[PDB]
Design a protein around this motif. Structure first.
Motif, mmCIF file in Angstrom:
data_model
loop_
_atom_site.group_PDB
_atom_site.id
_atom_site.type_symbol
_atom_site.label_atom_id
_atom_site.label_comp_id
_atom_site.label_asym_id
_atom_site.label_seq_id
_atom_site.Cartn_x
_atom_site.Cartn_y
_atom_site.Cartn_z
ATOM 1 N N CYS A 1 0.796 -1.212 0.000
ATOM 2 C CA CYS A 1 0.000 0.000 0.000
ATOM 3 C C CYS A 1 0.833 1.268 0.000
ATOM 4 O O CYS A 1 0.451 2.264 -0.619
ATOM 5 N N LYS B 1 -8.915 -7.169 -6.839
ATOM 6 C CA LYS B 1 -8.893 -6.880 -5.401
ATOM 7 C C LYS B 1 -7.463 -6.802 -4.860
ATOM 8 O O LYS B 1 -7.255 -6.786 -3.647
ATOM 9 N N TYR B 2 -6.485 -6.760 -5.756
ATOM 10 C CA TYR B 2 -5.078 -6.711 -5.348
ATOM 11 C C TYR B 2 -4.787 -5.544 -4.392
ATOM 12 O O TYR B 2 -4.043 -5.709 -3.427
ATOM 13 N N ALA C 1 -7.278 -3.802 -2.767
ATOM 14 C CA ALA C 1 -8.488 -3.572 -1.991
ATOM 15 C C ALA C 1 -8.237 -3.223 -0.522
ATOM 16 O O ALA C 1 -9.045 -2.525 0.098
ATOM 17 N N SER C 2 -7.128 -3.698 0.033
ATOM 18 C CA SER C 2 -6.801 -3.423 1.430
ATOM 19 C C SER C 2 -6.090 -2.086 1.645
ATOM 20 O O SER C 2 -5.738 -1.744 2.778
ATOM 21 N N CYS C 3 -5.881 -1.337 0.564
ATOM 22 C CA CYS C 3 -5.202 -0.048 0.638
ATOM 23 C C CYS C 3 -6.166 1.126 0.706
ATOM 24 O O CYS C 3 -7.339 1.012 0.351
ATOM 25 N N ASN C 4 -5.645 2.258 1.163
ATOM 26 C CA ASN C 4 -6.408 3.497 1.248
ATOM 27 C C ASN C 4 -5.862 4.381 0.140
ATOM 28 O O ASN C 4 -4.818 5.012 0.296
#
Length: 130
Positions: free
Chosen positions: A7, A123-124, A126-129
């Motif tokens: 990220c 979704k690679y 997806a956990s980032c802001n």
């Protein structure tokens, strides 16, 4: 020495206008870095398919993209390869932008071809802001 997390690299590349550059999404750029260098700014591959070497987070090769004292190079990015071994990756980014303008596009990076091009990257990040 610096090793980015996914990220953090995504944020950095997005701020440098990489998202959608030449039609390549941010996920593609980050995935290329993950497989070429595992986000390590000091990554170094000694003997590539050529008596050349790959440098930095984007593993730029010394026969085509940058100059090294070891042998001749096309030096298309007009810079010493060692400049790609520092913690700051602004120069690496500028060179990467030049690389994708060629016909092969991101296929210039073999690890991207083998591990990213064929993956569903929806979704690679997806956990980032972002």
């Amino acid at each position: 020495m610096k090793i980015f997390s996914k990220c953090e690299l995504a944020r950095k590349l997005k701020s440098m206008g990489m998202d959608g550059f030449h039609g390549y999404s941010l996920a593609n750029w980050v995935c290329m870095a993950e497989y070429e260098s595992n986000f390590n700014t000091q990554a170094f591959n000694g003997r590539n398919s050529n008596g050349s070497s790959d440098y930095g987070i984007f593993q730029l090769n010394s026969k085509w993209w940058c100059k090294s004292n070891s042998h001749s190079s096309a030096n298309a990015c007009n810079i010493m390869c060692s400049k790609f071994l520092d913690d700051n990756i602004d120069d690496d980014i500028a060179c990467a932008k030049r690389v994708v303008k060629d016909p092969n596009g991101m296929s210039a990076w073999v690890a991207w071809v083998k591990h990213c091009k064929g993956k569903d990257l929806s979704k690679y990040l997806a956990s980032c802001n972002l």
